[PDB]
Curated annotation (Swiss-Prot), chains A, C, F:
<dbReference type="GO" id="GO:0005829">
    <property type="term" value="C:cytosol"/>
</dbReference>
<protein>
    <recommendedName>
        <fullName>Uridine phosphorylase</fullName>
        <ecNumber>2.4.2.3</ecNumber>
    </recommendedName>
</protein>
<dbReference type="GO" id="GO:0009166">
    <property type="term" value="P:nucleotide catabolic process"/>
</dbReference>
<comment type="subunit">
    <text>Homohexamer.</text>
</comment>
<comment type="similarity">
    <text>Belongs to the PNP/UDP phosphorylase family.</text>
</comment>
<comment type="function">
    <text>Catalyzes the reversible phosphorylytic cleavage of uridine to uracil and ribose-1-phosphate.</text>
</comment>
<keyword id="KW-0808">Transferase</keyword>
<dbReference type="InterPro" id="IPR000845">
    <property type="entry name" value="Nucleoside_phosphorylase_d"/>
</dbReference>
<keyword id="KW-0963">Cytoplasm</keyword>
<dbReference type="InterPro" id="IPR010058">
    <property type="entry name" value="Uridine_phosphorylase"/>
</dbReference>
<keyword id="KW-0328">Glycosyltransferase</keyword>
<comment type="pathway">
    <text>Pyrimidine metabolism; UMP biosynthesis via salvage pathway; uracil from uridine (phosphorylase route): step 1/1.</text>
</comment>
<dbReference type="GO" id="GO:0004850">
    <property type="term" value="F:uridine phosphorylase activity"/>
</dbReference>
<dbReference type="InterPro" id="IPR035994">
    <property type="entry name" value="Nucleoside_phosphorylase_sf"/>
</dbReference>
<dbReference type="Pfam" id="PF01048">
    <property type="entry name" value="PNP_UDP_1"/>
</dbReference>
<dbReference type="GO" id="GO:0044206">
    <property type="term" value="P:UMP salvage"/>
</dbReference>
<dbReference type="GO" id="GO:0009164">
    <property type="term" value="P:nucleoside catabolic process"/>
</dbReference>
Length: 250, 225, 250, 225, 225, 250
């Protein structure tokens, strides 16, 4: 291979210049299957890569793993291999009461509560999505009939204290994050996740295009628990949206 | 007056929910002139405001003065009076070699090199534009055949930027100005929609352009009512 | 003109080396009138300039507009034109209950809650007034019989959240400024305004002399509302003080 | 499952109070193989866990994945399940001329160049290892005749460190990696014991070494039960 | 004793409301000797205190030791005992070419390059001297014919400043020392009056001077009673 | 002398390479007396130095005075004179209820709530003790039968607000330190003192070895007041421990 971690050569990509980048390698094949000629390329650690074809153009699907440091490796190596457009697909919880399970979130920019982004741009620089990618994602969502929210996501280097969770071993949240959730809610932040600050900052500062869509599978501010298909139907829809957006970006 | 600085009452707005906020009163009058039933409302310090109408709906045009601090007063007080969508239009230089004088820049988000944005959100929060506004500006620019670039703008307190420009150029930043970081942050963190467009009037290397940016912001406003 | 914004040439100043710098151009003529041969020089944006004579020396009066960025432009261009001494005159609210409407505040230094000052000196550097200017202002105040408070001012890049006002559209104040007013009150800060951090820092770090005086026209910590002359008599007195201070600095 | 990510229940631990936390599943299996009654428990995303026994006591081995963020999930969830002592083993380069490939590094504390540590304690708080753990690792290394260095490790989010290395070398820093700052800070600020050991696999200037570090972490674990 | 460190009671002060706070006990004795009825009160670690009288009123002289941290203890405990005005006198170098050995520097405010000042106010707050104190020091200096400079002093924790001096020179900073930032910040943010004077004993380019600064601080004290 | 402050020449040290560094010069002779041939070297300000012999090797005892700036002077000059190993001995209060008067604390690393440490290493660098020194101190404590706690200390540039004391002139604690004690307690911090951040950071970043031991003479979280020997017996024990640790480090 010609990259450190992904175990891929440039020829494996067959000239692909767009990648769909879910977090979980288990989600990779399912996304690749929506497209033509799904072919598994490689699998190393949490980096599972498949190649497929969309309207006659090669497309890559590759997992990022959890967190900014893992994500930065995936993105940088994929960019080395010629990828110029990155579409993140995820499932997420929401932190706004009016956002319902089954809804779709498209992120215009992220709150940079991480560290890896700082290696690519100073904090003053916005973790902003590319306009064409965001447009494609919003339009694909509309095409599917999805109830869609477009706005800011909080991107945290932790799942627990950075998302102000108290149901933990210590039950403690450090001063920086005490009361932070209510502050992000008041500022209209839609949800938390862990990878987008890195993805968006590194792309926006390096001439690459990125966008992010996620299906809401839980809402910790609603007391109703998510249905049996707490994920499934919504996960399916989010995947459909990301593939349809990729079709408009080729 | 209902507000501390602008000299306006809620009644003056006649139900307006969108404002166009350029920097100076000269530009205010030019923008108002493009719309229906333009009426000058008030002029106090940096803040000169007019009312006008698009498609039968009231719209405000109000100057912000120079910098985030004066901009923050205009935007807050207009919000107090019922405005929920804000469009800024400016004229700027560009710092990318492929951007030509006469081109139009639509800002997706700003580099927060200002002081006032921090008064609304900590530095980690993005100075990001509203998607509907950004879309309306791009669509309006396309509809008059403008050459458009969409991306990041660096926004600072000094007219002599920094106190990092080669750095910003290498990071893809399109241009520099002084008010967008505050406008976008204060809106995106407070449930208000904002967008930002500018006409390019200088660049290394390589009123017509102001007039075109002014028409674009008005036609974007129409789409957002 | 030989400066970007003020529309002035050096000859317009007639060798003036002291400027009085109110915020509001409407206040300019009234100040210039207290002196000899008031002559309007120019008017561009919020930069209205008059020239006058005090004891046979040319003096400038020029508005700064609102906020540090506008102020820095005015001050830098005036300094380009030969001004070496700057006296800020304002009207202000107070945040100490014992400070009464009609009182006069002279600022020794400011809390730097702005951004423009940082372009001239790192935050560690004090936004401090020149001793001769402060002395002149305190003495002029005493000469007029004014009740005078001498001390620290908080200089904010916003009128609203930076002054911890909650009577706003959002009703929200960001964490940095939540509880900040009570903290500044406990630390003996007299008042808020929006321009002095920039004015004082740029002057103190560039070999220029600056001072600031303000008349108190309101006190948000007192329930009594300011009299009909909520401003007038006090504004008049503050203007008298600044002119008399300038006379001692020529 | 009792936890959000690991796919484990308290019962799965069978009373275990110590976990060994390397980065990848391949290393997990190698470590488990050194102990008694090794059993693979679960594998979900980055987190592959096994149970085993030392001196009749259950011990967990669980991969952390890459970086502080994934490490922070593994450590928290294992703590939720009852683990109170955490030992990381890695392989790294060295940045000091006197450190030889094959040598073993035991980390007393880390330079906090990561983001996740800040989610547990402000920057002033030291990313310091537990004294019992550090002692057990040094003792275990000595017991197999390893050449050991004890001191500071620099810990960052990038595989391309910085975004200061000559600086770190002059300050005596032994080596670089990505997870120790988070591990040590989150443990030292939450009443959990943690230690960190690494085998040196490269240096300028000047599986055997991985195998030896793996044996050392297991023998240290034995001393800490 | 009424206080943790100084070994003093309120009664020891005999109603004193002003203290002179130099760094070392040798200077304390010299200052006390200039006043009426000097009496040594206590000596514990860095803190040697005397009582004396000016114009019939008690005054304290107490050493601070080296740096903001020890200074902060002396000033707090003296405040606890009733002192409300603090005058520091030191001897320093100068960093401006026009300042001559033998000249006297009166500090209007300090560059906050120390750690302890942050324990009283955030960095934005000015380390500014009280106006009455500054006035009294300038007046006292003039009254003995001293050549006086009034302006900014840089104040840090290191005897080897920085860890920016060319920077400070270009910004007009007069001189460097270690205690003024803490003294001035802790007083100005707590309702206490403070002033700072120093005699210049070295400069590039170009006990007599210590004696003159000592006389000046005593004569300033007289004006502030 | 060949150093600025200590008034010592290199020959005075007689080849000593280990120093015991208490805060208070009054404690110096008492420590030196536990060893062979105690000889007073010098006394300048709060820098009192004695030389002694331990197992035939020269050892120095030298006070640091209060705070990081004073400490940095002592340590740097001692290092200039050839000292390569520094053992701090102190008496301290505790902030954990389970830590009792008479107990001994050995510090593995410190919270850097000071300024002087920043001159030697950026804040990201840990104020960490040397392993050999800490081991020697823990073993010496065990040998004496001492009840020993090993862990983190908070090192503050102030005695008052940085230790969140409210029984002060102003009764005020700045925002940074409001609620800070409860936060350090939750994080398992043992105690506050004022010198170790500087001592440990400068040593750990300059190739020198340092450790710190302290006897607990008070606990502000317990309502029981320390016995008549609020210090004495405990001070004696701490001194015995530091000398015995030095014996293992020669």
């Amino acid at each position: 291979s010609d990259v450190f971690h992904l175990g891929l050569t440039k020829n494996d990509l067959q000239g692909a210049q767009l990648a769909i980048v879910p977090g979980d390698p288990e989600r990779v094949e399912k996304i690749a299957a929506l497209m033509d000629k799904p072919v598994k390329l490689a699998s190393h650690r949490e980096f599972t890569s498949w190649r497929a074809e969309l309207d006659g153009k090669a497309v890559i699907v590759c997992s990022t793993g959890i967190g900014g440091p893992s994500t930065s490796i995936a993105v940088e190596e994929l960019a080395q291999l010629g990828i110029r457009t990155f579409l993140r697909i995820g499932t997420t919880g929401a932190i706004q009461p009016h956002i319902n399970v089954g809804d779709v979130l498209v992120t215009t920019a992220s709150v940079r509560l991480d560290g890896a982004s700082l290696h690519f741009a100073p904090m003053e620089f916005p973790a902003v999505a590319d306009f064409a990618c965001t447009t494609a994602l919003v339009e694909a969502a509309k095409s599917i009939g999805a109830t869609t929210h477009v706005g800011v996501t909080a991107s945290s280097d932790t799942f627990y204290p950075g998302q102000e969770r108290y149901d933990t071993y210590s039950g403690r949240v450090v001063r920086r994050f005490k009361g932070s959730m209510e502050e992000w809610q008041a500022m209209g932040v839609m949800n938390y996740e862990m990878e987008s600050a890195t993805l968006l900052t590194m792309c926006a500062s390096q001439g690459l295009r990125a966008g992010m869509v996620a299906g809401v599978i839980v809402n910790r501010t609603q007391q109703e628990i998510p249905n049996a298909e707490t994920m499934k139907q919504t996960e399916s829809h989010a995947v459909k949206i990301v593939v349809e957006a990729a079709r408009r970006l080729l």
